[PDB]
Amino acid sequence: GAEAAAAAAVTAELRAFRAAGGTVELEDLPVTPETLARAEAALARLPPESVAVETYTVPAPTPEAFLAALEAALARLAAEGLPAILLRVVDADGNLVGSILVAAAGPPAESAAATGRVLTIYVASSPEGLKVARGLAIETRDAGGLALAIGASGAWALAGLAGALALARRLAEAHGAPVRVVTIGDPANPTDAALAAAIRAAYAAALEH
Amino acid sequence: GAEAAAAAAVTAELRAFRAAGGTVELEDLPVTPETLARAEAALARLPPESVAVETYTVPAPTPEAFLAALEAALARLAAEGLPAILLRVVDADGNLVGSILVAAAGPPAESAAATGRVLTIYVASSPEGLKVARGLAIETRDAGGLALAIGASGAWALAGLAGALALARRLAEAHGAPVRVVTIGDPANPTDAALAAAIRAAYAAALEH
Numbered sequence: 001g002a003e004a005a006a007a008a009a010v011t012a013e014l015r016a017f018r019a020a021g022g023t024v025e026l027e028d029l030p031v032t033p034e035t036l037a038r039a040e041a042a043l044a045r046l047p048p049e050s051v052a053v054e055t056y057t058v059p060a061p062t063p064e065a066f067l068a069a070l071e072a073a074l075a076r077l078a079a080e081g082l083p084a085i086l087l088r089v090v091d092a093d094g095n096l097v098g099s100i101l102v103a104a105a106g107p108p109a110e111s112a113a114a115t116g117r118v119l120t121i122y123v124a125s126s127p128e129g130l131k132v133a134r135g136l137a138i139e140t141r142d143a144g145g146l147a148l149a150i151g152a153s154g155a156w157a158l159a160g161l162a163g164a165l166a167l168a169r170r171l172a173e174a175h176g177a178p179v180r181v182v183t184i185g186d187p188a189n190p191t192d193a194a195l196a197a198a199i200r201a202a203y204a205a206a207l208e209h
Numbered sequence: 210g211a212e213a214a215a216a217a218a219v220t221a222e223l224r225a226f227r228a229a230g231g232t233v234e235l236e237d238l239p240v241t242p243e244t245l246a247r248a249e250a251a252l253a254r255l256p257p258e259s260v261a262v263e264t265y266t267v268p269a270p271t272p273e274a275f276l277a278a279l280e281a282a283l284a285r286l287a288a289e290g291l292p293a294i295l296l297r298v299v300d301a302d303g304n305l306v307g308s309i310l311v312a313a314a315g316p317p318a319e320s321a322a323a324t325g326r327v328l329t330i331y332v333a334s335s336p337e338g339l340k341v342a343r344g345l346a347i348e349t350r351d352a353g354g355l356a357l358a359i360g361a362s363g364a365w366a367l368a369g370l371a372g373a374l375a376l377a378r379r380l381a382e383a384h385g386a387p388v389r390v391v392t393i394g395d396p397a398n399p400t401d402a403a404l405a406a407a408i409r410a411a412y413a414a415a416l417e418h
Binding site for chain 2: 018024025026027028029030032176187188189192193194196197198200201203206207208209
């Protein structure tokens, strides 16, 4: 099904990042008072309503399409000199299938060199997890790194993660910097738990010899 | 199989902890320079070779047996006034099937009240993940909390986690304090990744309505 195909894309991108010479660091964090407070403090420095929005049409959940959309977002950030951009991702009928907040501290090649990490990819399904993912992406930007926060479910979340890993691989240019992937979940939300389980299973498959 | 039965026990204990009124916070952390340095700093405060060891015989991977072994370890800590104890867990032929480092800051009921967390359960399979799990358990103890670090694989790791969750539930006495479960994995190790995927899948099953 679409979810299985998107998971296979994640597995392939994880394998490809490692084959190019970089470690994938996968973390899973719960929404807790500590993580919510960190996210709020960072969001307050760059208030959500102050961030520019654009809408991209992606009719099917593919890694190639998410990679291209992310490259388009980075190009817009450079052209306008903005710290962040919020992407709404819609299907062929115009219905929203996800969002991506992209936060840059400078040229992506320099952030990778300065911080020792090429990209931090936060992923969440629930609006509660997504608030923390977005805030932690801004926190990473304020520390000098490039970060993005994907809010989506099922095949869309996995295809978005796969495209973000492809972006990390491209930006790393085989210089060996790691990429950090952070799933954020509300502890009670079965959808968030299902997403985390699917990402971990895709990661286990990528490491099998 | 034994692994499936042990995973079902984890799912049942997660469900039971929540039904008793507490949140399970599940975290997954990679071995990185930052986490290794934290673990080393804590291990240096309580050098591994200084910690008492005892060996328990557990012929089959059951939650009931791990719960009882953990209660025995806590009773020994109280009797001897020690900060930690390392358990070697062996099967019926005397072959090691796991280890558990148990670290207490005081009476477990008081640590739950003082820190707002009843127990922190670290789990790892590889010796590399286990070094970090053990060090972070000592770090938690030094912050005032009760912690344990399980080193095991497959059904033994899952049954150990299930017994530790049962211990957390017993110690919490329905007072509502959360339990934190932290899987630690070397980013390249497929066994560590398989363990994390199995724990996440068991967690997703516990949250399904």
